[PDB]
């Protein structure tokens, strides 16, 4: 149970080793303005994504950070967001836990 893949297509996305405790915990339960609730896991690093659009600070769950939508680069499924423009760390990923599949190397 080391590697996280895209649940839809199996694209390699991230590792458990790259979990990042932002503000005390790697898991944050959040809701967007459309009322959708997400369990978001924070990662220092990710791969196999495609970041779409320019960064936006509107409705950012993480103070000091602007967000870009992160799609699965393979199948185009929305996996979360990339965060940038902040400090300690400058950038990180917030990925939707239930859209990932955990398994071995």
Ligand X SMILES: Nc1ccc(C(=O)N[C@H]2CCC(=O)NC2=O)c(Cl)c1
Nearer Cβ to ligand X (24/33): 33
> Computed from CA positions of residues 26, 7, 37, 65, in that sequence, does the dihedral angle turn out positive or negative?
positive
Q: Around Cβ 37, how many Cβ atoms within 10 Å?
A: 9
- Among 4, 18, 41, 81, the residue binding ligand X under the rule CB under 6 A is 81
| Residue 61 interface partner, choices Zn ion, ligand X, none, CB cut-off 5-8 Å depending on type | ligand X
The answer to the question of whether 42 is labelled as a binding residue is no
Per CB under 5 A, 9 contacts Zn ion:
yes
Fill in the per-residue mask, 8 to 47: x = in contact with ligand X (CB under 6 A), - = not in contact.
------------------------xxx-------------
Q: Which of 74, 65, 71, 73 is nearest to 92 (CA)?
A: 65
Residue in the block written with tokens 């799609």:
71
Shortest reach from residue 79's CB to ligand X, in Å:
12
Residue 77 vs residues 20, 23, 35, 51, 80: alpha-carbon distances, Å: 23, 27, 19, 12, 9
Nearer Cβ to ligand X (69/101): 69
Instruction: Pick out the residues of the known binding site.
Output: 6, 9, 25, 27, 72, 75
């Amino acid at each position: 149970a080391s590697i996280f893949r895209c649940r839809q297509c199996g694209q390699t996305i991230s590792r458990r080793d790259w979990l990042l405790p932002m503000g005390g915990d790697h898991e944050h339960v959040v809701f967007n303005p459309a009322g959708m609730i997400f369990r978001v896991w924070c990662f220092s690093l990710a791969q196999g994504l495609r970041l779409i659009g320019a960064p936006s600070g509107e409705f950012s769950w993480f103070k000091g950070y602007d967000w870009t939508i992160a799609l699965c680069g393979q199948c185009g499924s929305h996996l979360g967001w990339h965060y940038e423009g902040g400090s300690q760390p400058q950038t990180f990923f917030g990925l939707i836990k239930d859209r990932l599949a955990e398994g071995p190397a």
